[PDB]
């Protein structure tokens, strides 16, 4: 069971490093790690300033189709649309293939549903012009309440999210199977399975963890739904666990 799930999960990874002190050397090492004996990850995920060196590293190792994702309005999810949009425009200028923006979740918790729509919509319009996919992080671990997790997912989808994502990986609680089910149920209920992907991020540590998340996906949408356009794992150490389950 774990071998089949681990090969699927590996090819859906957004292999991530997002540290306050990352270096070119660490990003280069991450790019090399993304090219495994059993397949390439879907993407890497790095801060915007590392996109040029990552792009050249991916080309020079012959994996030019590994996508480069980055983060904006991050990790805070503040409710200043001008800053979030400026950061998103800068990430596009740095060369991002995908932008993972943090939803203004504390503003939603305070009762403001509109700012989340306007922020996501503005960032989507910049990305769409550049053929850049937009993922939206709702920070389920800080929203906590099921109704707020559903509402943030709904707002993000209505505003044009291409993916909804659980977490930044920078708070106490990130992805859980519970949160993943709630968010994928919204994708189902809104009828957007064709156009909106799901990404659990943070706290996905083992091949066993990955298998549980994919089981939810297969149950809700069919075993043929998950692919790079519809599913990613936001993770790092997971990759070594997947390779171990596959005999590497």
UniProtKB/Swiss-Prot annotation:
Its main location: cytoplasm. Keywords: Acetylation, Cytoplasm, Lyase, Schiff base. Catalyzes a reversible aldol reaction between acetaldehyde and D-glyceraldehyde 3-phosphate to generate 2-deoxy-D-ribose 5-phosphate. Can also catalyze the double aldol condensation of three acetaldehyde molecules, leading to the formation of 2,4,6-trideoxyhexose. Optimum pH is 7.5 for 2-deoxy-D-ribose 5-phosphate cleavage. This is Deoxyribose-phosphate aldolase. Monomer and homodimer. The active site is at 100 (proton donor/acceptor), 165 (schiff-base intermediate with acetaldehyde), 199 (proton donor/acceptor). It is found in: Cytoplasm. Gene3D superfamilies: Aldolase class I. It catalyses: 2-deoxy-D-ribose 5-phosphate = D-glyceraldehyde 3-phosphate + acetaldehyde.
């Amino acid at each position: 069971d774990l071998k089949a799930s681990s090969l699927r999960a590996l090819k859906l990874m957004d292999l991530t490093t997002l540290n306050d002190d990352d270096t070119d050397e660490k990003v280069i090492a991450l790019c090399h790690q993304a090219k495994t004996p059993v397949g390439n990850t879907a993407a890497i995920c790095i801060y915007p300033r590392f996109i040029p060196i990552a792009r050249e590293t991916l080309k020079e190792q012959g994996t030019p189709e590994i996508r480069i994702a980055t983060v904006t309005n991050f990790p805070h999810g503040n409710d200043d649309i001008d800053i979030a949009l400026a950061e998103t425009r800068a990430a596009i200028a740095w060369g991002a293939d995908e932008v993972d923006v943090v939803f203004p979740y504390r503003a939603l918790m305070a009762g403001n549903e509109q700012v989340g729509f306007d922020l996501v919509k503005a960032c989507k319009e910049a990305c769409a012009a550049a053929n850049v996919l937009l993922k939206v992080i709702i920070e389920t671990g800080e929203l906590k309440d099921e109704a707020l997790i559903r509402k943030a997912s709904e707002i993000s989808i209505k505003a044009g999210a291409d993916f909804i994502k659980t977490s930044t990986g920078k708070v106490a609680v990130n992805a859980t199977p519970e949160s993943a089910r709630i968010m994928m149920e919204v994708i189902r209920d809104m009828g957007v399975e064709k156009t909106v992907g799901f990404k659990p991020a943070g706290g996905v540590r083992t091949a066993e963890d990955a298998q549980k998340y994919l089981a939810i996906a297969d149950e809700l949408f069919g075993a043929d739904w998950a692919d790079a356009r519809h599913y990613r794992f936001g993770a790092s150490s997971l990759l070594a666990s997947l390779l171990k389950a596959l005999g590497h």
